[PDB]
Amino acid sequence: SDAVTIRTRKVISNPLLARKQFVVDVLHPNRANVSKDELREKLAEVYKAEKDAVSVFGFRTQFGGGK
């Protein structure tokens, strides 16, 4: 009964670069920092945009794991 849970926060528009930028919340019980490629897929589908068009960098995994 485990599965990644994806959330956005501080969604900010950016017409200057024609983009949206924000912080991503990735709850993951029984997992080790769900990989960036799948994250790209899931955010891309959520925001309806293109897979390689969405981009993500720079995670940290809180001590004790899970988030």
Partner: protein, 465 residues
């Protein structure tokens, strides 16, 4: 053939239905109805039939059940979907058939049809858990035995009408296909204190919210069979939970007497505490008596996105709004004072005067608790129930800064565990059917001084206009 023109034509049939009903009502309005309908998804309370119901002549009926201690019920109502106009009902034969689900402490699960407002809920099917499901191993990694073996506590049907989920002290969630009433999956809760206490689905969704005695609210996604999130923060047990469409839930955690509203997506719980002050209350009434303290908190549900109602254990019924931390308005012993125990019994002695002087008068009087509290979403009418055998219907003041008594229904007899609401008929005249699961005992323990002459059953209240 095309999806686009399929939607177009279906919304057409919707629209000539609308205009035909406009002609009917005339024998503007279209836009107003459309605005109400769509804006349902957001905003404050808007259904304003508080003064429209015809309460005194409500058709009242009671039905017995073949077992004891009906602890919970939940009614599911397929709705003409406003997004895509087929239905909320899944199968063609369902065609908008109204369903009721009952769970009883005898490890009893029942599916009733309630499609008619005159006749009684017809027992479509039943299932029984037994001791033949006790897991032989105790590691609890495999609590995967597919039947109940200890004290079902509550039930809720996924508002898509496909599955029904039930939970009890046996630290498991059991999800069943509706029409066969068949156990499709077990979800262990995986903890030794983890008796499930209450369940609620997020409206029109797949999310399920299990308030667990592990001080926690576990949160699941049904059709993915997944445990989404496990939120923390209460002090003692969590007792009641309810929600609406938005990713918000409300839980009263009892003994620490706190009422928390969890906004999930941003991961934040706003906290409410009661705490009426008896000395101030008595002096305020001297400014012109029995003022009981909030021992615990038991039952909560939300009318809307910003206001909600809380049931104490000492008669207090409170309207809270998100902004002010205190309850914006509060109501006293409303379910009335529980009777004075018999003099002869309480004394165990011959001198009637000794019996009275041991009754000690007022200092022994005690209030009715609050057992079932519920509201129709975004309405301005809410229903309160105790074991006084009398449901109390209340209307929120259209200011949303108070509420008043609308009326009484004396069809109940015994402990009112759960209240649920169904609506049918046309929009102009909606026929309400309120279903009250009544048992002889409380939901959780027995704890109750053998209330006189009660029956495990269903109390149906059909109200018109």
């Amino acid at each position: 053939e095309n999806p686009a023109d399929k939607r177009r034509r279906l919304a057409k049939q919707y629209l000539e239905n609308l205009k035909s009903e406009a002609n009917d009502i005339l024998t503007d309005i279209i836009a107003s109805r459309l605005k109400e309908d769509v804006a349902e998804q957001q905003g404050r309370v808007f259904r304003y039939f508080g003064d429209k119901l015809l309460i005194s002549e409500a058709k009242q009926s009671f039905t017995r059940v073949g077992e004891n201690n009906l602890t919970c019920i939940s009614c599911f109502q397929p709705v003409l979907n406003k997004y895509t106009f087929e239905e909320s009902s899944n199968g063609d034969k369902n065609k908008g058939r109204l369903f009721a689900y009952t769970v009883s402490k005898d490890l009893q699960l029942t599916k009733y049809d309630i499609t008619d407002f005159s006749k009684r809920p017809k027992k479509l099917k039943y299932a029984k858990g037994g001791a033949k499901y006790i897991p032989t191993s105790k590691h609890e990694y495999e609590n995967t035995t597919e039947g109940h073996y200890d004290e079902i506590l509550t039930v809720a049907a996924s508002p898509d009408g496909k599955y029904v989920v039930t939970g009890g002290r046996d630290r498991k969630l059991i999800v069943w296909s509706t029409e066969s009433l068949s156990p499709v999956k077990v979800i262990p809760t995986k903890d030794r204190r983890g008796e499930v206490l209450s369940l609620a689905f997020r409206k029109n969704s797949d999310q399920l919210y299990a308030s667990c005695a592990d001080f926690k609210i576990r949160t699941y996604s049904i059709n993915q069979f997944s445990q989404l999130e496990i939120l923390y923060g209460h002090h003692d047990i969590v007792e009641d939970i309810s929600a609406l469409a938005m990713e918000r839930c409300v839980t009263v955690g009892a003994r620490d007497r706190t009422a928390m509203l969890w906004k999930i997506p941003d991961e934040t719980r706003l906290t409410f505490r009661g705490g009426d002050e008896p000395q101030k209350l008595l002096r305020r009434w001297m400014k012109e008596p029995l003022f009981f303290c909030e021992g615990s908190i038991d039952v909560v549900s939300m009318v809307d996105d910003f206001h909600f109602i809380t049931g104490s254990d000492n008669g207090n019924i409170c309207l809270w709004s998100l902004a002010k931390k205190k309850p914006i308005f509060t109501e006293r012993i409303a379910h009335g004072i529980l009777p004075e125990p018999s003099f002869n019994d309480i004394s165990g002695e011959t001198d009637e005067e000794l019996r009275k002087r041991q009754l000690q008068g007022k200092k022994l009087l005690q209030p009715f608790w609050i057992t079932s509290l519920y509201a129709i979403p975004y309405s301005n009418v809410f229903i309160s129930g105790s074991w006084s055998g009398s449901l109390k219907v209340w209307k929120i003041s259209d200011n949303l800064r108070s509420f008043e008594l609308l009326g009484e229904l004396s069809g109940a007899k015994g402990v009112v565990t759960k209240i649920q609401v169904v609506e049918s008929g046309k929009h102009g005249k909606e026929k309400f059917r309120i279903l009250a699961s009544i048992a002889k005992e409380h939901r959780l323990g027995r704890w109750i001084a053998n209330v006189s002459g009660a029956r495990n059953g269903i109390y149906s209240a059909v109200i018109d206009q």
